[PDB]
Structures are given as C-alpha cells and as structure tokens.
From Swiss-Prot, chain A:
UniProt function note: L-tryptophan decarboxylase; part of the gene cluster that mediates the biosynthesis of psilocybin, a psychotropic tryptamine-derived natural product. The first step in the pathway is the decarboxylation of L-tryptophan to tryptamine by the decarboxylase psiD. 4-hydroxy-L-tryptophan is accepted as substrate by psiD as well. The cytochrome P450 monooxygenase psiH then converts tryptamine to 4-hydroxytryptamine. The kinase psiK catalyzes the 4-O-phosphorylation step by converting 4-hydroxytryptamine into norbaeocystin.
Taxon lineage: Eukaryota, Fungi, Dikarya, Basidiomycota, Agaricomycotina
Residues of the full protein shown: 403 to 438 of 439
Domain of life from the UniProt record: Eukaryota
The protein's name in its UniProt record: L-tryptophan decarboxylase
Organism: Psilocybe cubensis (Psychedelic mushroom)
Family: Belongs to the phosphatidylserine decarboxylase family.
Biotech / industrial applications: The pharmaceutical interesting psilocybin as a treatment option against depression and anxiety is being investigated in advanced clinical trials.
C-alpha cells in the first residue's frame, strides 16, 4: 503493498474525484491530484 | 542449513517460549479444532519450508499471509502481532527469506509449468495475462523489460521479476501532461484506489473512532506532522498483479526519509472474527484494514518539497503488508527528482 500520498490544507492541489471510489484503477504516473 | 529449523526460526520459537505471556498468546490464537498449522510448532515448521521456496501464482495473497490469516483473525493473534519484540523477529525471518528470493535459485518459479490445479509459475499464460490487464492489449514482454526467448524471461531471481521495469514507460505509463507541467501530481504506485480522507487529524488511541488515519501515528510524530493536520490523504493497494516500483509524484527535492519499525500481521480490531472469504471477490478482514494498519505497519515515510511552491511539502508513505514489507528508497535526501523518476521499490522482506 500500500502507498499513501498526503497533501497539506494550504495545498490547493485537489485529488481527482474518481479515485474516491474504492477499486478504481490507478495507473502509475497518471494524475491523482492537480491544482485548479 | 540442512537439518532442523533455520536458526532464525529456531530463535523465533525460543523467543515465543521465553515469555509466558507471548507463549500463551501463541497457544490461544490456535483455539478451536484446526487444520495445519495446528500449533506454533507446526507454524514454525511451515515457515521453514516457505522460506526455502519462491511464491507461486494462484492464491489471493503471498504464502505467509495465507497461513497467518486465521491467526490474525483472533484477539490473541492481534495481541502478539502488536508487540515490537515479536515483530523484530518477523523482520529477521522475512529479511532472511528475501536473501533466497534474490538468489538465482528463486527463478524456478519463473516458468510456465502448472504445479497443480490451483497454482502455476509466473511465466504461464494465466499469470502473464493477469499482470497486463491494465495495459490496453499489450503483452507482458512488450510492457516489461525481459527476454521472452530466454529462460526465466531473462530474470536473475524472484526479486528481479517482482521488481521488473517498464520497457517503455512513455508508451505504457506516460507522465500525464509532461514532466514540465508542475501543476499535476502523479501516482507513485501502480495500484487500485483504496481510500480518500479529507480534513485528516490525529487520534490519541487507535481503537473505535472509525479505524481512520491518525497523522501523529502514520507520520511517527514527525515535526512536519502539524502542517498536515486538516489535509487530505489518498491510499492505494498493490495487488499480486501489480508493478512494485515507486515513481516520483512531483518534480521536487527529497527532504526526509524515515523507516519505521511496525507491525506485519495486524488487522483492524473491528474486523477480528469476521469470516475469511473462500471466493476471489469478497475482501478478507486484513484487506479491509489498510487504512488502520497504515498507522502502525512497517513503513517508510518520504517528505518531498515540490518545485511548485503552490504544492510544496507533500508526504508519501509506503506501507508494508505481511512478508512484503521491505521499503527500499533509491533516492537520497537532498536529491532532486523529476515527476516519474524512480523513487524506490517494495521487496519481500522485513
């Protein structure tokens, strides 16, 4: 296995919504958070 | 060694017997009518065979998890598995096991042979097809660096195969947006999403309360911890079928790497006694505990400073599970990484 990415509150980069559903495929290097 | 238990297991056994409380915990966890292992002596004997062999394809989890799952699912098991003295011994067992897994004799599972009706080697089409399921119709030898015309696909060991590299990441796993876009944070691992938590916090104790993240625990009371209060965490799970290397989530500088001794076999207390599925779909108790044991498991914490000051300081936590708990960084503090660069990898080991 498991990994965790942690972001600060000040950080305005936001987790991509589709990853809030468990079981969604995470392709290594794809975007999991972005600044608006 | 040829005759008797490997000395590390023998010391493991003697430690169990040297503490009345630990010894009784290793009796109580086996309670009820059992199959093998029926007691802690059978468990040790069974470790003695597993640690001389490489894993095969076919079970839901790696070989030690398979035989520990029923013990984990007890109050007495969870109690023994959350003593640091016992977990030091597990580290040594799995570290010793990793030695064999890095030797050339671990390649005997890098074959197409079907060992029985439930198991086969990693070069059998059934295994090959499982490992490329998220690669858009491309084959294992196209996605991964290997020699499909060489014995063992050219791999030197089970660990060499477990940590295979992408042959052309820019084809199969692009750094979406390009390394030069500093507004995007890449996934550090090939995985399935497991959880996302917003407005994360710290807990005084890790019981009830939702079995959630506790920042002060997960980050081992790091001084940076307060900066991450009220933040967010995304957690993923890496299957048997998954690439096991780490990639850099941002362009940035490695600030701090911390390796934390932890547990190997601890599941969430609210799961103890839940049925362990015999199908391949429904999650077993330990696999419902990833958020819980992220606080206490053998892990590596990596703080990175993103070149983009609007992203800034982030943390990665690489979390072990049972015998796959070695977290190897291949980057150094003060090193600058570009998003997508090798950051490290998981190994079988402690």
């Amino acid at each position: 296995x498991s990994f965790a990415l942690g972001l600060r509150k000040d950080c305005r980069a936001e987790i991509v919504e589709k990853f809030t559903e468990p079981g969604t495929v995470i392709r290594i290097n794809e975007v999991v958070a972005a600044l608006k | 060694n040829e005759f008797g238990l490997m000395q590390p297991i023998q010391e493991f056994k003697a430690f169990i017997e040297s503490d009345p409380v630990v010894h009784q915990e290793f009796i109580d966890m086996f309670e009820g009518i059992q199959d093998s292992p029926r007691n802690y002596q059978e468990l040790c004997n069974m470790f003695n065979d597993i640690f001389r062999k490489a894993p095969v394809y076919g079970d839901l989890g790696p070989p030690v998890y398979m035989i520990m799952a029923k013990l984990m699912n007890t109050r007495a098991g969870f109690s023994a598995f959350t003593r640091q003295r016992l977990n030091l011994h597990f580290k040594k067992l799995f570290d010793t096991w990793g030695l064999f897994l890095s030797s050339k004799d671990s390649r005997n599972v890098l074959v197409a042979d079907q060992f029985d009706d439930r198991h086969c080697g990693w070069l059998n089409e059934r295994a090959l097809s499982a490992m490329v399921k998220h690669y858009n119709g491309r084959a294992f030898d196209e996605v991964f660096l290997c020699d499909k015309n060489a014995p063992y696909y050219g791999f030197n060991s089970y660990d060499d195969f477990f940590n295979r590299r992408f042959r052309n990441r820019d084809i199969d796993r692009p750094v979406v947006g390009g390394v030069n876009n500093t507004t995007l944070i890449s996934a550090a691992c090939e995985s399935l999403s497991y959880n996302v938590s917003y407005d994360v916090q710290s807990l005084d104790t890790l019981v009830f309360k939702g079995e959630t993240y506790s920042l002060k625990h997960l980050l081992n009371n790091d001084p940076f911890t307060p900066q991450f209060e009220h933040g967010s965490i995304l957690q993923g799970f890496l299957n048997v079928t998954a690439y096991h290397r780490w990639h850099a989530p941002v362009n940035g500088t490695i600030v701090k790497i911390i390796n934390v001794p932890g547990t190997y076999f601890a599941q969430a207390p609210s799961t103890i006694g839940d049925p362990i599925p015999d199908n391949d779909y429904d999650p077993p108790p330990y696999l419902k505990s990833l958020v819980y044991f992220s606080n206490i498991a053998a892990r590596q914490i990596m703080f990175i400073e993103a070149d983009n000051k609007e992203i800034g300081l982030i943390f990665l936590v690489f979390i072990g599970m049972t015998e796959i708990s070695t977290c190897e960084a291949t980057v150094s503090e003060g090193q600058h990484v570009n998003r997508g660069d090798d950051l490290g990898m998981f190994h079988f080991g402690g």
